[PDB]
Amino acid sequence: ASQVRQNYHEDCEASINKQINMELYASYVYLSMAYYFERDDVALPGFAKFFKESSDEEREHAQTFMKYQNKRGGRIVLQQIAAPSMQEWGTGLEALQAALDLEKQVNQSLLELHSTASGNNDPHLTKLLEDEYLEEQVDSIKKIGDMITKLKRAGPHHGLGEYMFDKELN
Amino acid sequence: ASQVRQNYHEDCEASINKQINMELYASYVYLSMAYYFERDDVALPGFAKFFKESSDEEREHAQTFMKYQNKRGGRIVLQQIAAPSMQEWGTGLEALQAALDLEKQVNQSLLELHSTASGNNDPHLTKLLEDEYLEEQVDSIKKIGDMITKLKRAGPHHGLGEYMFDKELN
Amino acid sequence: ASQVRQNYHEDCEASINKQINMELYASYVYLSMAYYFERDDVALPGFAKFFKESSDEEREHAQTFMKYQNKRGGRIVLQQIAAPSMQEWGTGLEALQAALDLEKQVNQSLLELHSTASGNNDPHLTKLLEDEYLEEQVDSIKKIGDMITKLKRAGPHHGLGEYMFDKELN
Amino acid sequence: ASQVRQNYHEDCEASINKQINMELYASYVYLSMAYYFERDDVALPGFAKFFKESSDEEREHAQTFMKYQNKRGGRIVLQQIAAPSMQEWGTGLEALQAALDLEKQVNQSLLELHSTASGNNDPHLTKLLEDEYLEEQVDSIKKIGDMITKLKRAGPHHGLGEYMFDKELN
Numbered sequence: 138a139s140q141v142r143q144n145y146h147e148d149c150e151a152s153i154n155k156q157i158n159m160e161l162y163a164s165y166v167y168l169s170m171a172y173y174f175e176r177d178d179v180a181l182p183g184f185a186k187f188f189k190e191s192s193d194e195e196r197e198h199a200q201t202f203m204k205y206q207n208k209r210g211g212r213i214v215l216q217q218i219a220a221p222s223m224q225e226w227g228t229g230l231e232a233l234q235a236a237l238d239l240e241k242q243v244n245q246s247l248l249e250l251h252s253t254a255s256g257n258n259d260p261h262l263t264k265l266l267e268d269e270y271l272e273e274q275v276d277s278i279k280k281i282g283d284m285i286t287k288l289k290r291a292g293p294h295h296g297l298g299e300y301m302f303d304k305e306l307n
Numbered sequence: 308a309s310q311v312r313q314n315y316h317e318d319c320e321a322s323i324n325k326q327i328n329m330e331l332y333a334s335y336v337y338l339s340m341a342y343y344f345e346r347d348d349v350a351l352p353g354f355a356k357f358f359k360e361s362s363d364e365e366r367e368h369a370q371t372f373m374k375y376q377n378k379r380g381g382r383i384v385l386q387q388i389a390a391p392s393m394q395e396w397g398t399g400l401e402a403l404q405a406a407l408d409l410e411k412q413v414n415q416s417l418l419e420l421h422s423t424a425s426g427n428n429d430p431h432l433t434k435l436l437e438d439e440y441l442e443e444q445v446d447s448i449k450k451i452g453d454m455i456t457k458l459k460r461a462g463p464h465h466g467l468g469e470y471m472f473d474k475e476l477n
Numbered sequence: 478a479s480q481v482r483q484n485y486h487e488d489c490e491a492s493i494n495k496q497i498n499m500e501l502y503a504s505y506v507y508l509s510m511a512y513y514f515e516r517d518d519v520a521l522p523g524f525a526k527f528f529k530e531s532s533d534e535e536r537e538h539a540q541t542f543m544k545y546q547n548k549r550g551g552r553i554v555l556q557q558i559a560a561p562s563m564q565e566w567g568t569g570l571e572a573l574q575a576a577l578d579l580e581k582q583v584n585q586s587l588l589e590l591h592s593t594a595s596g597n598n599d600p601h602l603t604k605l606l607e608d609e610y611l612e613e614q615v616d617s618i619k620k621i622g623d624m625i626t627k628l629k630r631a632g633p634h635h636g637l638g639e640y641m642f643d644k645e646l647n
Numbered sequence: 648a649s650q651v652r653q654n655y656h657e658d659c660e661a662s663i664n665k666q667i668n669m670e671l672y673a674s675y676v677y678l679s680m681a682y683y684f685e686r687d688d689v690a691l692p693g694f695a696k697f698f699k700e701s702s703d704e705e706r707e708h709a710q711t712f713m714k715y716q717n718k719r720g721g722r723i724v725l726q727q728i729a730a731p732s733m734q735e736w737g738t739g740l741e742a743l744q745a746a747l748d749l750e751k752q753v754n755q756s757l758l759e760l761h762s763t764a765s766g767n768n769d770p771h772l773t774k775l776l777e778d779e780y781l782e783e784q785v786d787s788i789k790k791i792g793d794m795i796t797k798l799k800r801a802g803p804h805h806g807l808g809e810y811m812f813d814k815e816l817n
């Protein structure tokens with residue numbers, strides 16, 4: 138085994154490799170939304186910018202798990218990144234609702250990864266998940282929730298409300 | 308009695324202690340509104356900021372009466388601070404209307420406190436009430452009144468008007 | 478339930494609402510001490526400043542729990558804030574001893590809240606309590622303990638020692 | 648009568664002339680204390696500085712009444728300024744207690760002057776007394792009261808406590 142490995146269970150190592158793929162997949166979803174909102178027949182530059190940034194952050198999240206894997210002496214195994222579930226995301230509200238659902242799915246996976254680390258008595262992994270992932274996930278979910286509510290207030294259908302709310306994200 | 312006390316009537320001293328509790332209560336009401344408007348299903352950051360600031364100012368108002376009590380040689384007696392009348396404040400318009408009603412109730416109490424000081428021939432207390440409280444109360448009531456009118460103009464129901472007016476308070 | 482809520486147990490939500498009331502109560506205790514020490518017949522400006530700052534920090538602590546409640550999708554319920562246990566706090570030493578006892582009571586409640594979060598497998602809540610509350614509570618208790626010892630050294634009775642120690646807190 | 652005089656009663660004009668003499672007398676008392684505390688066998692430079700400043704402020708107070716008299720069209724009449732009641736003021740505590748008694752005597756006279764202005768329906772004079780004199784008098788009395796308490800705490804007799812408290816006034 139690796140000269141650095143210590144108190145790092147095979148199951149944690151494998152679960153990290155799957156979370157890497159999930160972070161890369163979410164980055165890919167957000168990239169698809171981002172350029173969907175730059176179509177000439179959608180033209181929502183605030184939504185585009187918001188999802189482009191979310192795409193970058195998710196790819197950074199994947200890289201932090203890749204650095205982590207190497208740090209503990211695990212070995213990174215990357216799988217194919219699935220095509221996004223959709224090619225068209227509808228209105229801003231529907232994209233946000235899809236992002237909300239995706240963020241809570243990522244959160245579920247992260248909490249299961251914390252349970253695996255806790256079960257294998259890995260406080261260093263539980264610390265990483267709490268400090269770097271669980272905290273950021275809850276803030277993201279709250280922020281997307283706020284945005285959904287604000288957009289429902291402003292007028293969620295393809296109208297003046299969507300146009301004005303889009304300016305808030307620019 | 309206190310080495311500093313002079314021309315300070317027992318009734319003024321007791322009325323100050325009650326106004327302290329009322330200022331602390333109003334600060335508590337505004338704190339409740341402030342974080343109500345940060346709920347993920349309300350998401351009105353301008354209203355939240357406005358009431359958070361009003362909460363701070365009211366607690367400062369209480370402290371100025373506490374400094375005053377000590378300055379005149381009275382003795383501060385603090386009572387329990389009642390729970391806010393509501394836990395949910397509805398729309399921005401309903402919160403402003405509730406704030407308007409509360410501000411005029413505080414004003415009434417302050418004018419009664421001025422009558423007590425005037426009846427006991429305490430020009431130093433009448434000066435404090437006129438310079439530090441009555442002036443600020445009338446400006447607050449006018450400002451809340453303007454805001455109610457502006458919100459009724461923009462569209463007081465949970466719609467684009469409320470969303471846009473909220474930006475004016477950020 | 479809230480669109481953001483996930484892995485947030487009813488018991489944690491209710492325990493947060495009680496800790497909010499406790500933080501607000503401690504803020505109220507410290508406010509009472511602060512202006513007690515500004516009485517013309519006490520005149521300990523260092524103690525006054527120390528407890529005024531502690532009053533502000535506790536009210537900030539309550540607000541961080543209120544932000545937290547909203548972040549997780551819980552609903553804030555504020556109760557009445559009890560009158561402070563005392564209206565007069567005696568000497569500086571007796572106020573510090575009362576603060577020490579209060580700080581350890583708050584700490585106990587926070588450790589019970591950590592046990593509730595741990596029992597319901599909420600690592601996000603355990604992280605908040607460890608990073609934002611437990612750490613600050615232990616430092617506060619150590620600092621108050623140091624101060625009690627320093628004051629007992631300088632001379633805890635209403636004398637030159639209390640007067641000099643008070644300068645250290647200004 | 649003066650081309651400027653309007654709503655200025657003979658009694659208010661005469662009462663101002665007496666308050667001028669009283670302010671000048673208090674300035675003279677404080678000047679005596681100030682240089683008493685610079686005697687080689689007293690040597691309390693903090694007390695000296697405190698009373699020298701109080702002497703200057705009282706003489707400024709007299710001048711503000713003299714400017715006021717002229718402003719309203721009254722005519723200034725200055726009487727002899729009595730010798731201070733004492734030539735030696737004892738300890739710092741006894742000087743502060745004498746200042747406290749003098750400040751409350753000045754306050755009494757000012758409140759009687761407010762009653763005279765109120766009885767003659769002179770809101771301009773009541774405003775001057777509230778804004779320029781009553782406010783400053785209550786703050787002075789509170790500050791002297793604090794100082795007496797601090798000195799009694801530090802040790803009011805000619806000892807280390809008096810020596811240390813004196814440094815606080817430098």
Ligand SMILES: [Fe+3]
Nearest residue numbers: 160195198243
């Ligand atoms: Fe992520």
Ligand SMILES: [Fe+3]
Nearest residue numbers: 330365368413
């Ligand atoms: Fe107020």
Ligand SMILES: [Fe+3]
Nearest residue numbers: 500535538583
């Ligand atoms: Fe706290």
Ligand SMILES: [Fe+3]
Nearest residue numbers: 670705708753
């Ligand atoms: Fe004066």
Ligand code: NI
Nearest residue numbers: 191194273277
């Ligand atoms: Ni995110």
Ligand code: NI
Nearest residue numbers: 228293294295
């Ligand atoms: Ni639609």
Ligand code: NI
Nearest residue numbers: 292293294295
């Ligand atoms: Ni619709």
Ligand code: NI
Nearest residue numbers: 361364443447
């Ligand atoms: Ni106000």
Ligand code: NI
Nearest residue numbers: 398463464465
């Ligand atoms: Ni409505």
Ligand code: NI
Nearest residue numbers: 462463464465
């Ligand atoms: Ni309508």
Ligand code: NI
Nearest residue numbers: 531534613617
């Ligand atoms: Ni603390």
Ligand code: NI
Nearest residue numbers: 568633634635
């Ligand atoms: Ni004692």
Ligand code: NI
Nearest residue numbers: 632633634635
């Ligand atoms: Ni002893």
Ligand code: NI
Nearest residue numbers: 701704783787
């Ligand atoms: Ni003065």
Ligand code: NI
Nearest residue numbers: 738803804805
């Ligand atoms: Ni003596």
Ligand code: NI
Nearest residue numbers: 802803804805
């Ligand atoms: Ni003695």
